[PDB]
Amino acid sequence: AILNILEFPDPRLRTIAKPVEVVDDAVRQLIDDMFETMYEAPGIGLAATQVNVHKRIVVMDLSEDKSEPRVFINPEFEPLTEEMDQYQEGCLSVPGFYENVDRPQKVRIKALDRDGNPFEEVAEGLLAVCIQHECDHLNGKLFVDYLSTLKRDRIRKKLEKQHRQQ
Numbered sequence: 001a002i003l004n005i006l007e008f009p010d011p012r013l014r015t016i017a018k019p020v021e022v023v024d025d026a027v028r029q030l031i032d033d034m035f036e037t038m039y040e041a042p043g044i045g046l047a048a049t050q051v052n053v054h055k056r057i058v059v060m061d062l063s064e065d066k067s068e069p070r071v072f073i074n075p076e077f078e079p080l081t082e083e084m085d086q087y088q089e090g091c092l093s094v095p096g097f098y099e100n101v102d103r104p105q106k107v108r109i110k111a112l113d114r115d116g117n118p119f120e121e122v123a124e125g126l127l128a129v130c131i132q133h134e135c136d137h138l139n140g141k142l143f144v145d146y147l148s149t150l151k152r153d154r155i156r157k158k159l160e161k162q163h164r165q166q
């Protein structure tokens with residue numbers, strides 16, 4: 001199923017997601033719907049908060065051909081260096097806008113996989129950017145939160161206008 005993706009400034013995007021206590025079949029079915037939603041948008045990552053399911057679940061596929069689905073349940077990360085990098089980010093919940101965001105350039109991810117087993121993973125580049133961006137969603141944070149207040153308000157106003165016209 002293709003789930004509806006919430007869009008800024010919907011307050012539901014600010015909800016803090018709750019950890020997943022057991023990765024059962026319902027969780028894997030939600031994950032499958034999230035990937036379908038994500039691939040159809042299309043986008044390279046998606047957090048459950050974005051589809052209004054407030055659980056700590058993230059899916060991603062950084063390939064150009066759907067050949068590398070990745071699952072992160074109860075993800076966390078820790079910067080591995082103090083160095084920062086800029087990347088122009090977009091978001092399915094803030095469609096049509098792309099702005100630079102500075103974030104730690106390398107982080108160590110820790111999460112549960114699709115079977116519920118814990119693993120860790122060093123991330124740099126697009127992977128490090130995407131994992132931080134998706135974990136932010138789970139804590140009710142959007143990339144526009146890093147922008148100047150005036151730029152974020154300009155974004156909000158445009159989206160609000162679009163939502164009224166739709």
Ligand SMILES: O=C(C[C@H]1Sc2ccccc2NC1=O)NO
Pocket residue numbers: 042043044045046047050088089090091092093129130133134137
């Ligand atoms: O909205 C999304 C999908 C985004 S994640 C992202 C972050 C930095 C640069 C590009 C993207 N692209 C996505 O599709 N995830 O929450």
Ligand code: NI
Pocket residue numbers: 090091092093133137
């Ligand atoms: Ni996003």
